[PDB]
Amino acid sequence: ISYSMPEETESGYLVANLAQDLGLRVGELTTRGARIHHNGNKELLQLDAERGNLLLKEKPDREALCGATEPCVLHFQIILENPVQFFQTDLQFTDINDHFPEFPDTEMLLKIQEIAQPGTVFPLKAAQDPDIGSNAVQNYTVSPNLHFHVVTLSRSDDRKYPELVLDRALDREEQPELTLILTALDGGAPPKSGTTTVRIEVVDINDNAPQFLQSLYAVEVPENSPLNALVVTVSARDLDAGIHGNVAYSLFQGGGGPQPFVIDEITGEIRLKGALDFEATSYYTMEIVATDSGGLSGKCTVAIQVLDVNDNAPKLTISSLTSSIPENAPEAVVAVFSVSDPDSGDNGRMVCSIQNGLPFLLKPTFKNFYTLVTERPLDRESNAEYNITITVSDLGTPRLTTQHTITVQVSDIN
């Protein structure tokens, strides 16, 4: 004979009316010297022989008695002596939902990279439940968010294990860290729950390119500026963090000609490497390029205009027509000369002068092109030779003067 009864029933519960089930008289139970025999460690059942009833001595717990084995049936044998008779009886215990779903870890750590595409699965630790069947784990739900959703798998021996599925791509630049609530629901009535915290750490991915604060840099620097002069400092910013955010500055020269400028890849400072000359090159158009450790780059145009400095003296060049000059020759051209100046503005503008005492005349024929002509015929006895010191001088600040001497002799017939 076999009897069935729910788990965790209070001790002293009336199991079965043994007297009626055996079809024997009430006094016969104590008459035959009814005893109970079993190899169990604990005597779960005590026999009331006077009323012929089978009673529980202690409160049973299925998980501690059977555990994983199902059905939980305990076999024992009751013996009678008058006459000698044996009766094997089995007792089955129906499992109840008296266990709450418990997660292994109080928090689960997930480090998901930013470029993780939707549909990507992530394994989660399952909630365990010592119960059996519908009283065990049945459902898994995740706290309402816009990124993930959990799905339950009944793989293998019908043991349910949850895994998290991504639906919308992550972004560390928007939300660095996620915190979800993983809830496990039982299939019993009423259902039992078990909650844990899913900690999602979004790993940074270099998906952002560095950009300069200014698209154009325009700075003026004098020609006579000292070596290692701070021309301009350039700054670029990256939206990413760590090594993925570090930038490296590189100088791209424009067209031909050497660039006397150097950039620091770290600080972003542009400084003088060589010499500057407004007369050689007055305007530089270059491009600074900041690049991360990934290859993503940003570019900016830097324009540097050199300032003019009066550091050039006028170049006086003279070609003589007549080494000697007749006495009674009116209006004679002694020599013709031209002046030069690479500078600009008043630094390039130049006025030339001659001694006022000399009977000669400077006649400006062409632009920066003068002629030295005698103003009147000359006698020999007065002055044999003449030292004419032409002095060309610019109108800049400071003023630079260049002068040259020519000797002209007046001569009649030999």
Ligand X SMILES: *[C@@H]1O[C@H](CO[C@@H]2O[C@@H](C)[C@@H](O)[C@@H](O)[C@@H]2O)[C@@H](O[C@@H]2O[C@H](CO)[C@@H](O[C@@H]3O[C@H](CO[C@H]4O[C@H](CO)[C@@H](O[C@@H]5O[C@H](CO)[C@@H](O)[C@H](O)[C@H]5NC(C)=O)[C@H](O)[C@@H]4O)[C@@H](O)[C@H](O[C@H]4O[C@H](CO)[C@@H](O[C@@H]5O[C@H](CO)[C@@H](O[C@@H]6O[C@H](CO)[C@H](O)[C@H](O)[C@H]6O)[C@H](O)[C@H]5NC(C)=O)[C@H](O)[C@@H]4O)[C@@H]3O)[C@H](O)[C@H]2NC(C)=O)[C@H](O)[C@H]1NC(C)=O
Ligand Y SMILES: *[C@@H]1O[C@H](CO[C@@H]2O[C@@H](C)[C@@H](O)[C@@H](O)[C@@H]2O)[C@@H](O)[C@H](O)[C@H]1NC(C)=O
Ligand Z SMILES: *[C@@H]1O[C@H](CO)[C@@H](O)[C@H](O)[C@H]1NC(C)=O
Task: Please report whether residue 338 would count as binding a second copy according to CB under 8 A.
Answer: yes
Task: Please report whether residue 326 would count as binding a second copy according to CB under 8 A.
Answer: no
Give residue for tokens 């989660």: 124
Instruction: Name the binder of 139 from a second copy, Ca ion, ligand Z, none, CB < 5-8 A by kind.
Output: ligand Z
Task: Please report whether residue 1 would count as binding a second copy according to CB under 8 A.
Answer: no
Q: How far apart are alpha carbons 289 and 299 in whole angstroms?
A: 4
Instruction: Name the binder of 197 from ligand Y, ligand MAN, ligand X, none, CB < 5-8 A by kind.
Output: ligand MAN
Cβ–Cβ < 8 Å for 408, 318: no
Q: Tell me whether residue 360 is exposed, middle or buried, using C-beta atoms within 10 angstroms of its C-beta: 0 to 12, 13 to 18, 19 or more.
A: buried
Least Cβ distance, residue 182 to ligand Z (angstroms): 13
Task: Please report whether residue 407 would count as binding ligand X according to CB under 6 A.
Answer: yes
Report how far apart, in Å, the C-alpha atoms of 253 and of each of 275, 304, 306 are: 16, 12, 16
Q: Rule CB under 6 A: which of 101-140 touch ligand Z? A: 139
Residue of minimal CB distance from ligand X? 387
Contacts of residue 237, defined as CB under 8 A and 6 or more positions apart, other chains included, come to: 210, 211, 213, 247
Q: CA end-to-end span of the chain, whole Å? A: 168
Q: How far apart are alpha carbons 240 and 328 in whole angstroms?
A: 92
List residues binding ligand MAN (CB under 6 A). 106-107, 179, 181, 183, 191, 193, 195-197
Task: Please report whether residue 409 would count as binding ligand Y according to CB under 6 A.
Answer: no
Residue 92 token pair: 């089955």
Out of 15, 127, 247, 306, which residue is the one contacting a second copy (CB under 8 A)? 127
Q: How far apart are alpha carbons 224 and 188 in whole angstroms?
A: 90
Nearer to ligand MAN, 143 or 368 (CB): 143
Out of 31, 53, 92, 141, which residue is the one contacting ligand Y (CB under 6 A)? 141
Q: How far apart are alpha carbons 43 and 60 in whole angstroms?
A: 11
Q: Which stretch binds a second copy (CB under 8 A): 53-61, 75-83, 174-182, 227-235?
A: 75-83
**Residue 15 backbone phi and psi in degrees, to 5:** -75, -60
Q: How far apart are alpha carbons 254 and 198 in whole angstroms?
A: 54
Instruction: Name the binder of 379 from ligand MAN, ligand Z, a second copy, none, CB < 5-8 A by kind.
Output: none
Q: How far apart are alpha carbons 318 and 302 in whole angstroms?
A: 44
DSSP for residue 315: E
Residue 259 token pair: 């660039």
Cβ–Cβ < 8 Å for 126, 137: yes
Give residue for tokens 């009336």: 14
Instruction: Name the binder of 394 from Ca ion, ligand Y, ligand Z, none, CB < 5-8 A by kind.
Output: Ca ion
Nearer to Ca ion, 276 or 334 (CB): 276
Instruction: Name the binder of 281 from ligand Z, ligand Y, ligand MAN, none, CB < 5-8 A by kind.
Output: none
Out of 14, 115, 218, 275, which residue is the one contacting a second copy (CB under 8 A)? 115
Rounded to the nearest 5 degrees, what angle is found at the Cα of 120, between the Cα atoms of 114 and 123? 105
Least Cβ distance, residue 350 to ligand X (angstroms): 22
Least Cβ distance, residue 130 to ligand Z (angstroms): 20
Q: Which stretch binds a second copy (CB under 8 A): 44-52, 222-230, 260-268, 362-370?
A: 362-370
Q: How far apart are alpha carbons 5 and 306 in whole angstroms?
A: 101
Instruction: Name the binder of 171 from a second copy, ligand MAN, Ca ion, none, CB < 5-8 A by kind.
Output: Ca ion
List residues binding Ca ion (CB under 5 A). 61, 63, 95, 97-99, 129, 131, 135, 171-173, 186, 192, 204-208, 238, 240, 244, 277-279, 292, 308-312, 341, 343, 347, 394
Amino acid letter, residue 151: V
Q: Rule CB under 8 A: which of 163-192 touch a second copy? A: none
Q: Tell me whether residue 331 is exposed, middle or buried, using C-beta atoms within 10 angstroms of its C-beta: 0 to 12, 13 to 18, 19 or more.
A: exposed
Nearer to Ca ion, 230 or 280 (CB): 280
Rounded to the nearest 5 degrees, what angle is found at the Cα of 291, between the Cα atoms of 289 and 296? 115
Task: Please report whether residue 145 would count as binding ligand Z according to CB under 6 A.
Answer: no
Out of 74, 262, 336, 358, which residue is the one contacting a second copy (CB under 8 A)? 336
Out of 30, 387, 401, 411, which residue is the one contacting ligand Y (CB under 6 A)? 387
Task: Please report whether residue 387 would count as binding ligand X according to CB under 6 A.
Answer: yes
* List of residues contacting ligand Z (CB under 6 A): 139, 141
